[PDB]
Design a protein around this ligand. Structure first.
Ligand SMILES: Nc1ncnc2c1ncn2[C@@H]1O[C@H](COP(=O)(O)OP(=O)(O)O)[C@@H](O)[C@H]1O
Ligand SMILES: Nc1ncnc2c1ncn2[C@@H]1O[C@H](COP(=O)(O)OP(=O)(O)O)[C@@H](O)[C@H]1O
Lengths: 234, 120, 234, 120
């Protein structure tokens, strides 16, 4: 959108990608220079780091790409009849290691009985969930014994209402109306070290719209945030 | 022999730098953030501090500042190892009392050369 | 600059970094799944590929960074008495492998005896030279037996004049005023597969201008291009 | 026994895909671009073609089209292995006669399963 933001966005891609790349290069050089000083357990572990860090770097490039394909109207949806209960459970599982690395518990509740059959693109809604769940982890409290991110299913106003709730840092009022924009991070002393580009919620907003749905937020600074996603059923 | 205090918020980075330090004979104490690091100095005095910048709770610039503001702590050499490789970042860290700023991504062998130099 | 360019830029970062990442990941997985079917010389070779592709990915991220540090005016040149003849040779050496991978010969003449003392920042003029040399390789002819990039050193107008000349694809006239603009890439059937962001020449210009110098281009489509860099001797 | 024509502009990528194919006992012929690929079809008939998209001289979409315009070449299965992962790129490649499109970065072991599937 803006231009002052664009130059900040360019410096943030550099910094977010540099972290896995540091691991990749240090691990590879170490294996190469230390072949006689690694046991088999450690060699395999170090190779798995390279692979896992590559997979994280890859996810970040798919974000940049997905963001261009939404800006080019060249992105489209294939709806199906998915069990939403099972889809959330899948997403919750995919984020478990990242959540553990930040001491964040990931919960899933359904207010309604399961299955919750609704007509959606499974790939793209999983990506909506992952972005929200990831943000719950990244923006969790810095030092607290009871950090959580909770996904809540309900059926409402015809469609399905998905809430992603956290007890994280929260979001100031002036920021609430800007967090879904492109290249927009709520700069503050509580976000300084957290990596990102500002595309995750812009992307999530576009995908929710393409389903005919909407997304909004409620937050309290110091307490936490709730992201509401409403998509029609059929 | 020599004891190294390694301060970075990435478990993945700590592991590889620790592997390389131990390959030289050094003992390694780890800290996940700047505050935890300052807390560990109550229990020992390192021969060297390897310090990142972007950490939650207490960042590396604050750690460097606080290291200068106590007599016992101010002479411990610090190598800053960081993805913030701008020349101003560097000059701030050196003005804050860092002996050396090394950029990420880094070469493990060059890093170890520098650790060795600072230790001898 | 413009926004349509930004949607293109974003997709181009993704594509330029995905190539080395693909090699990193494939090579790492292959080592991990083939430790019994790998001899030592092959193991070491595959590890070196991971390391070299990491180094290339790192170079690309240093470009995004330098671009943001120039675009936020934070980048600060730092000058010395440098022998340009040495600096050029060093640059020629650094590109030899990449040049060879595309069958491009890299030469050096310069019209003056060496040494050629100049008052410049050696790091940043190396980056200028490497970007021009890189471009001479990237935009070389698709299928020719005599491809080259040549650096010509002279002293002119009380300053140093560096020419980087190639017998590459050349540049159409409409594009010649646009190529130094951030994000600008010539879109043609001869540039389709060539990866890049459009930042390199934007960066090169700002560095040249921080030295109080200028950069311009002469080209003919189908024949080649000459980039002229004039920097004051003081 | 089975012969694979591997078509990609990156020597680094040809090398790793060739390693994994030879590890299964397949023979591998390499081509650096689409035109060189079509040239080699004079010399033999592969059981499989592994094809990139972004290549100089002749890109992969053009190779796929040219493969349909000749009885002898029409029936050779093609796996497209490409960094252009978009849904429209995929649909175009499948409409041009590709049997499978896989994205880069790729898992070598999933790649190989699909090479086997198509060979059997
Ligand atoms: N759960 C959350 N708690 C607090 N802040 C959040 C949360 N989710 C998003 N944000 C804020 O919204 C901004 C935009 O989020 P997003 O578009 O995913 O970008 P990024 O995570 O890359 O910054 C973030 O920088 C952050 O300031
Ligand atoms: N030596 C050259 N020959 C032909 N075209 C060139 C040459 N150097 C630069 N160009 C053209 O100018 C554009 C901008 O160059 P640059 O800023 O270095 O970005 P990039 O190489 O990432 O596209 C290139 O996309 C290309 O079209």
């Amino acid at each position: 959108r803006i231009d002052r933001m664009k130059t900040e966005f360019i410096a943030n891609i550099s910094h977010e990608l540099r972290t896995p790349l540091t691991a990749i290069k240090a691990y590879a050089e170490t294996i190469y220079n230390s072949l006689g000083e690694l046991d088999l357990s450690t060699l395999k572990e170090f190779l798995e780091v390279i692979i896992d860090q590559s997979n994280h770097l890859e996810n970040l490039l798919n974000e940049l790409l997905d963001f261009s394909r939404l800006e080019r109207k060249s992105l489209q949806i294939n709806r199906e009849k998915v069990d939403l209960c099972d889809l959330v459970e899948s997403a919750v599982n995919a984020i478990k290691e990242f959540a553990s690395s930040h001491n964040v518990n990931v919960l899933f509740e359904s207010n309604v009985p399961c299955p919750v059959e609704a007509y959606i693109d499974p790939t793209r809604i999983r990506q909506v969930l992952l972005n929200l769940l990831n943000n719950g982890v990244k923006y969790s409290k810095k030092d607290a014994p009871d950090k959580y991110v909770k996904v809540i299913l309900d059926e409402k106003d015809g469609g399905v209402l998905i809430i992603v709730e956290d007890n994280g840092i929260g979001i100031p009022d002036h920021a609430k109306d800007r967090i879904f924009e492109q290249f927009y991070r709520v700069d503050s002393s509580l976000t300084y070290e957290v990596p990102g580009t500002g595309l995750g919620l812009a992307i999530t907003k576009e995908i929710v719209e393409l389903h005919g749905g909407r997304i909004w937020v409620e937050s309290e600074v110091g307490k936490g945030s709730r992201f509401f996603v409403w998509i029609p059923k059929d | 022999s020599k004891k190294v205090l390694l301060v970075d918020d990435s478990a993945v980075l700590r592991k590889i730098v620790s592997f390389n330090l131990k390959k030289e004979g050094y003992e390694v104490i780890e800290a996940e953030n700047g505050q935890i690091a300052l807390e560990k100095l109550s229990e020992f005095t390192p021969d060297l501090i390897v310090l990142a910048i972007m950490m939650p709770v207490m960042d590396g610039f604050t750690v460097l500042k606080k290291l200068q503001e106590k007599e016992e702590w101010k002479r411990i050499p610090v190598i800053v190892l960081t993805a913030k490789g701008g020349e101003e970042d560097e000059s701030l860290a050196l003005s804050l009392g860092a002996r050396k700023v090394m950029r990420k991504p880094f070469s493990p062998s060059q890093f170890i050369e520098e650790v060795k130099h600072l230790l001898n």
